[PDB]
Design a protein around this ligand. Structure first.
Ligand SMILES: [Fe+3]
Ligand SMILES: [Fe+3]
Ligand SMILES: [Fe+3]
Ligand SMILES: [Fe+3]
Lengths: 163, 163
């Protein structure tokens, strides 16, 4: 049941990356709140909470497999963006990086014939598709506002509904 | 309604200190989980969640008062302690530092005649008393185990009950 160290290290690295992800989304919330979009800010706070659930999934899996977690320093995230689109494009680029990190754990797990970790990671592959899809949809809806503040505010209301 | 910058900065500093507090308690959880005390680890995870509620209280108060939040880098917390007592003594020392930081905001708020911030901080003064009390009680119960593993495990079970 004991997990290989190279896979352990990769999962611990990912845990720390999910923590930074949470912090980055909270920083995007600080931007939207300062720009007066409480709905966009709400969506970001929810996303920050979701990223913490990802981190704790990795946390508890590592201990299930006999490893231990070492928390690393969290870098200072950006706190400003040149507009709503710029913020969500930054979120999409961030998620693309997370997705490629997940595939690297998948590669290391299979090289170790660690099918338990391969199975564990399947949820995260599906979740990355979902999260990229949601960010693409927001970018699409924003593009289709064609700069009209009436539409942009209705989008703020919509994203403010996130459960 | 707009808050003074020196008080704004003090609240933003405290927000960042509550974030580190959350991270420190999660790190204590990683220690207890590696030592096989899932009840102690549970208590630490709950405390980490509580510290995030403190941080978000500061977050939303700053925006209520017309300020903005800037998130700073989170330092790497310690991840090892020389035993259960050592961990909780570290938590007590950490909370003592948080408490003196809260009083410094109180001083700056009153110098600005910012009674709104004085009122806001009253909950945190009471919460620090509560948190110091809980850590002192755990240290007392641990001391009274007199090294007996039977009692120490029942304490793990008790702390594992935290809602
Ligand atoms: Fe994630
Ligand atoms: Fe994500
Ligand atoms: Fe606190
Ligand atoms: Fe505290």
């Amino acid at each position: 049941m004991v997990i290989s160290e190279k896979v352990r290290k990769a999962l611990n690295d990912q845990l720390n990356r999910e923590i930074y992800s949470s912090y980055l989304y909270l920083s995007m919330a600080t931007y939207f709140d300062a720009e007066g979009f409480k709905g966009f800010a709400h969506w970001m706070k929810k996303q920050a909470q979701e990223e913490l659930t990802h981190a704790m999934k990795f946390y508890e899996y590592i201990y299930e497999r006999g490893g231990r977690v070492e928390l690393e320093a969290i870098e200072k995230p950006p706190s400003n963006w040149n507009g709503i689109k710029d913020a969500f494009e930054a979120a999409l680029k961030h998620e693309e990086f997370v997705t490629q990190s997940i595939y690297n754990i998948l590669e290391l797990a299979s090289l170790a014939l660690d099918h338990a970790t391969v199975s564990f990671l399947k949820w995260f592959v599906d979740e990355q598709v979902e999260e990229e899809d949601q960010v693409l949809e927001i970018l699409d809806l924003l593009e289709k506002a064609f700069g009209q503040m009436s539409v942009i505010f209705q989008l703020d209301r919509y994203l403010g509904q996130r459960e």
